[PDB]
Design a binder for this molecule. Structure first.
Ligand SMILES: COc1cc2nc(N3CCOCC3)nc(NC3CCN(C)CC3)c2cc1OC
Ligand SMILES: COc1cc2nc(N3CCOCC3)nc(NC3CCN(C)CC3)c2cc1OC
Ligand SMILES: C[S@@+](CC[C@H](N)C(=O)[O-])C[C@H]1O[C@@H](n2cnc3c(N)ncnc32)[C@H](O)[C@@H]1O
Ligand SMILES: C[S@@+](CC[C@H](N)C(=O)[O-])C[C@H]1O[C@@H](n2cnc3c(N)ncnc32)[C@H](O)[C@@H]1O
Ligand SMILES: [Zn+2]
Ligand SMILES: [Zn+2]
Ligand SMILES: [Zn+2]
Ligand SMILES: [Zn+2]
Ligand SMILES: [Zn+2]
Ligand SMILES: [Zn+2]
Ligand SMILES: [Zn+2]
Ligand SMILES: [Zn+2]
Lengths: 263, 267
């Protein structure tokens, strides 16, 4: 498959399988931006946007939008700072339409979409996954977790929860089971190389942050991308199946889980 | 020619401003936006399942495309220009392909959602203040730009005193809404009225199909020469209100809103 994204992303995203006869997945709708099925009532009031007054490229410390994360966390190249808290990331507020800066300012990384070459491919033990077709320096924006915005009440009534991302006031979830992007195919890794960060762009409704994946380290060509699904995932799912990341750091293998109960 | 792009890089192309008539600097008492904004909720139907979509897997140039069928037929040609036969007097509502469609994004039913492609220039006119012109020829049927502004209700439009930048959206059912580009708008806010206009508005649906909120796309109604001023017909509601304050200066011999013209009708 030449482009699973049907031209909706900045770059084509191919699918390959060199492991078995399983065909490229088609039981979902590809979308490049979050969708709704019943109103979420996102606050789109342009006068509720906090914005900056910059006349430069927003690389100075006086930029309010940068100040909303204590400081802008991007360097000149669009990458997270070396000092960035990869354990507890702050909320990033990117420049918006209420700002006076141009569209090519330095605070517009995530909203400018995918730039690295990625591949949907068949793994050996985890079904489909995504890997890099190129080296990727630490701090690089990879892709966004795109799906269907739903409420916790609705998340409760859905049988399939294998593609849920939590957004925790009142709680909401991103559900990429029926509608989603390339992110829906990223596997859980006990030794992860991408992290999620909560980000705001066109609106600043704090109930609905958007999820951006950045690299936590240098990633070699062909390396599988993975993040930490967290314990709420594994507390539910482990009585059905156990982790196959194979790391010696694995925290969710049948082996690891059994060693724990002995103690 | 001080400002190289009034859109601050938000459009596919830059839109420069020049003034060769007086000392008035490039206008800045408004905010440039490349898309419609809200100030109080419009509650647009954004239900992705309420989208009518097609099953096309080709470039949607087929007769089978449901999206094209919604306007009876896709009215764009292979180059993205309106058909010669397009009703330029009472234009149909056009439904372009969307995210629920199975076609790729480089489909042939996606002209307006692909944004501006011709070179335009904000410039100082002689008798009408600021205007917009072509820095290139524009063939008939070509998409120029969209009328972008603040989505408000008819009720709210009644309450705002400055009404020089309003476009009416009169849905069949009633429940009328307006685009107000006085405080927020794009290059379209600077386009002047022409009694013999060379652009027409078309109502278009793209990312949503909330019928209360058509998006307004301007196409050329005829060939336009390089340097020609762009204009549409603002309509009678505009002039029925404004002509007791000022009169039309389009200078056409077809003008129907000049002091001359207005005086001739009383008999
Ligand atoms: C990050 O991964 C998961 C997040 C999940 N989040 C919720 N909710 C958020 C809180 O508010 C109730 C919803 N429910 C799940 N599961 C429910 C459990 C109950 N089931 C009937 C419906 C799905 C999840 C499951 C996840 O992985 C398996
Ligand atoms: C296309 O041009 C115009 C459209 C206008 N539309 C409305 N509406 C509110 C009432 O429903 C219909 C849409 N009001 C205007 N103006 C005034 C606003 C001030 N108010 C005291 C009376 C109505 C307009 C003015 C226009 O140009 C001068
Ligand atoms: C969001 S999906 C990722 C795409 C999925 N691998 C596929 O083939 O469609 C998450 C599901 O993939 C499988 N999976 C993901 N990470 C795994 C892991 N670390 N170990 C074992 N299975 C995993 C499980 O079926 C899990 O419910
Ligand atoms: C939406 S604006 C167009 C931009 C405006 N000329 C400017 O410089 O800001 C509408 C206003 O432009 C002027 N105008 C537009 N067309 C005109 C015309 N044909 N004759 C006289 N004045 C016109 C009127 O003042 C009208 O209220
Ligand atoms: Zn700034
Ligand atoms: Zn900025
Ligand atoms: Zn800003
Ligand atoms: Zn593991
Ligand atoms: Zn089609
Ligand atoms: Zn379509
Ligand atoms: Zn199409
Ligand atoms: Zn006239």
């Amino acid at each position: 498959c030449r482009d699973v994204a049907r031209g909706y992303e900045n770059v084509p995203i191919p699918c390959v399988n060199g492991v078995d006869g399983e065909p490229c997945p088609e039981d979902y709708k590809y979308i490049s931006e979050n969708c709704e099925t019943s109103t979420m009532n996102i606050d789109r009031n342009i006068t509720h946007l906090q914005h900056c007054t910059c006349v430069d490229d927003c690389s100075s410390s006086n930029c309010l939008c940068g100040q909303l994360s204590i400081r802008c966390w991007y360097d000149k190249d669009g990458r997270l700072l070396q000092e960035f808290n990869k354990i507890e990331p702050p909320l990033i507020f990117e420049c918006n339409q209420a700002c006076s800066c141009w569209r090519n300012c330095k605070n517009r990384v995530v909203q400018s979409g995918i730039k690295v070459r990625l591949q949907l491919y068949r793994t050996a033990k985890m079904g489909w996954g995504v890997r890099a077709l190129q080296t990727i320096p630490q701090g690089t924006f990879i892709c966004e977790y795109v799906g269907e915005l739903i409420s916790d009440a609705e998340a409760d009534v859905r049988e399939d929860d294998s593609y849920l991302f939590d957004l925790d006031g009142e709680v909401y979830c991103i559900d990429a089971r029926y509608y989603g992007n390339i992110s829906r195919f990223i596997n859980h890794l006990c030794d992860p190389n991408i992290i999620p960060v909560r980000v705001f762009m066109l609106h600043q409704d704090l109930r609905f942050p958007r999820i951006a994946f950045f690299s936590s380290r240098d990633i070699r060509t062909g390396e599988e991308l993975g993040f930490d699904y967290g314990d709420r995932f594994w507390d539910i799912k482990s009585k059905y199946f156990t982790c196959q990341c194979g790391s010696e750091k694995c925290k969710h293998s049948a082996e690891a889980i059994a060693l724990e109960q002995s103690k």
